[PDB]
From a paper:
Proteins of the RRNPPA family are the most frequent pheromone receptors in Bacillota and use small secreted oligopeptides as pheromones. While most members of the RRNPPA family act as transcriptional factors through DNA binding, Rap receptors are specialized members that exhibit the capability to develop their function by interaction with specific protein targets. Binding of the pheromone produced from the propeptide, which is named Phr in this RRNPPA subfamily, induces Rap receptor inhibition. Our results reveal that distinct maturation processes generate multiple mature pheromones, which bind to receptors with varying affinities but produce identical structural and biological responses.
Initially, the structure of [name] was solved in complex with [name], the peptide with higher affinity and stabilization. The [name]-[name] complex crystallized in C2221 space group, showing a monomer in the asymmetric unit, which generates by crystallographic symmetry the prototypical dimer observed in other crystal structures of Rap proteins. The structure revealed similar architecture to other Rap receptors, with an N-terminal 3-Helix bundle (3HB) domain (residues 1–69), followed by 7 tetratricopeptide repetitions (residues 95–376) conforming the TPR peptide-binding domain, connected by a linker of 26 amino acids (residues 70–94). The putative dimerization of [name] is due to the interaction of the 2 TRP domains that hide a large surface of TPR7 from the solvent. This surface is generated by the mutual interaction of the TPR7 and other TPR elements that conform the peptide-binding domain, explaining the cooperative effect observed in pheromone binding. All 4 peptides bind to [name] in the low nM range, but the internal Phr3T pheromone has the highest affinity (EC50 = 5,28 nM). As could be anticipated since all the structures show identical conformation, the analysis the [name]-peptide complex revealed a quite similar peptide recognition for all of them, with a core amino acid set critical for binding across all peptide versions. This core comprised N226, a conserved asparagine residue in Rap proteins that anchors the main-chain peptide and up to 23 other amino acids interacting with both pheromone side- and main-chain. Among this set of residues highlight the role of tyrosines Y151 and Y225 with several contacts with peptide residues in positions from 1 to 5, or D338 and Q182 that interact with the N- and C-terminal peptide ends. Comparison of complexes with [name] and SRGHTS peptides showed that the sidechain of Arg in position 1 for [name] mediates a network of salt-bridges with D264 and D335 plus hydrophobic interactions with M304 meanwhile the Ser in this position for SRGHTS only makes a hydrogen bound with Y225.
Author numbering:
A (entry chain A): 7 to 70, 77 to 372
B (entry chain B): 1 to 6
Write the structure that this text describes.
């Protein structure tokens, strides 16, 4: 009855990828009943601990000493003599975790280890998971061509099956966001409106609001800040009216709305938005998002270029060059309007430096 | 800011 547990853990992972929580809870229960009467295969035990971890990552996406850091504890104490697909799962899942912690280098390191084992992965849907997650981190690193390379592979496999809508939406996010990085907002809007339509079909509040956020990033790119300010606002109430008011990623939408309202020269409204966003980053214990709201504040409110510089260095040390570029670009532009062309030059150069670093 | 990819 040892393969009987392995088969059930596979089924468990099938349902996790399908975002069927009721089935995932059914399989997790059956597995835990089965482990009671099995004979301590340490690999089977680790397969179980990895699936628990992956199951928890699903649950934390759908609803935000957490169960996760306790589960991650169990995983690293048994990283001894790994081989085959279990080693692949180990590194893939570990890279996922590290990505959610803003540990981009760690995550890419883990993902590269998993990638070496890709030929062991018979399941096409499993390979698609890998390609999507890899594409995602490449996008966050502004590795646009690498991201596009992986994301096409994933979304082709997902679209070849049926109930992978959630992943298909997310792949549409990645592709669209890549086209944006290439200054094609008009090429990116189709993919986001497509995602928006599918997310309303399955009534996923999170995905709906992230579509608005991604669409607002287009208007913002087209300097249509009115329309951009709308998209951001509605996506924020989406997250808030549906139990996502404490998801870290709402800070993204707050941050860009704060930027947009300041660019609309609605100074006072812009203050009542950087505010909610500064305190929320404090509350959710996200140092990286807090320091991006500081940058906005020090820029449009304070002109404390010194702090601006200190934040830019921080974000570079954090391997978030894309945010370095975007923020230095906000600074450079704003000072250009204020005709402080001298220091406006300083930030234009920083933009050049970040763009160069991204290319290496 | 990066778009939402998840």
């Amino acid at each position: 009855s040892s393969s009987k547990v392995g088969v059930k853990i596979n089924e468990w992972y099938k349902y996790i990828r399908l975002f069927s929580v009721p089935d995932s809870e059914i399989l997790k229960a059956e597995v835990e009943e089965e482990i009671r009467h099995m004979k301590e295969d340490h690999d089977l035990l680790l397969y179980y601990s990895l699936m628990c971890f992956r199951h928890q990552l699903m649950l934390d996406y759908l609803e935000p000493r957490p169960k996760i850091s306790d589960l991650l504890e169990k995983i690293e104490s048994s990283q001894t003599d790994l081989k085959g697909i279990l080693e692949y799962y180990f590194n893939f899942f570990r890279g996922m975790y590290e990505f959610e912690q803003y540990e981009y280098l760690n995550a890419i390191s883990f993902y590269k280890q998993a990638e070496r084992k890709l030929s062991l992965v018979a399941d096409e849907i499993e390979r698609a998971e890998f390609h999507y997650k890899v594409a995602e981190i490449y996008y966050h690193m502004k590795q646009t061509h690498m991201s596009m390379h992986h994301i096409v592979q994933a979304i082709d496999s997902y679209k070849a099956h049926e109930n992978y809508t959630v992943r298909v939406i997310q792949c549409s996010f990645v592709i669209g966001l890549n086209y944006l990085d290439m200054d094609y907002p008009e090429k990116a809007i189709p993919h986001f409106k497509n995602a928006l339509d599918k997310a309303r079909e399955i009534d996923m509040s999170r995905l709906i609001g992230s579509s608005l956020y991604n669409l607002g990033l287009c208007s913002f790119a087209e300097e249509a800040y009115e329309k951009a300010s709308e998209y951001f606002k509605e996506g924020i109430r989406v997250y808030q009216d549906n139990g996502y008011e404490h998801s870290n990623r709402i800070l993204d939408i707050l941050l860009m709305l704060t930027k947009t309202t300041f660019k609309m020269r609605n100074h006072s409204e812009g203050i009542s938005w950087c505010a909610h966003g500064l305190s929320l980053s404090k509350n959710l214990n996200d140092e990286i998002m807090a320091k991006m709201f500081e940058f906005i504040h020090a820029l449009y409110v304070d002109n404390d270029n010194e702090k601006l510089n200190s934040i830019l260095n921080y974000l570079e040390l954090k391997s978030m060059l894309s945010d370095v570029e975007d923020l230095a670009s906000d600074a450079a532009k704003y000072y250009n309007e204020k005709e402080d062309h001298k220091v406006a030059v300083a930030y234009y150069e920083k933009v050049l430096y970040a763009r160069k670093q991204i290319q290496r | 800011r990066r778009g939402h990819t998840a």
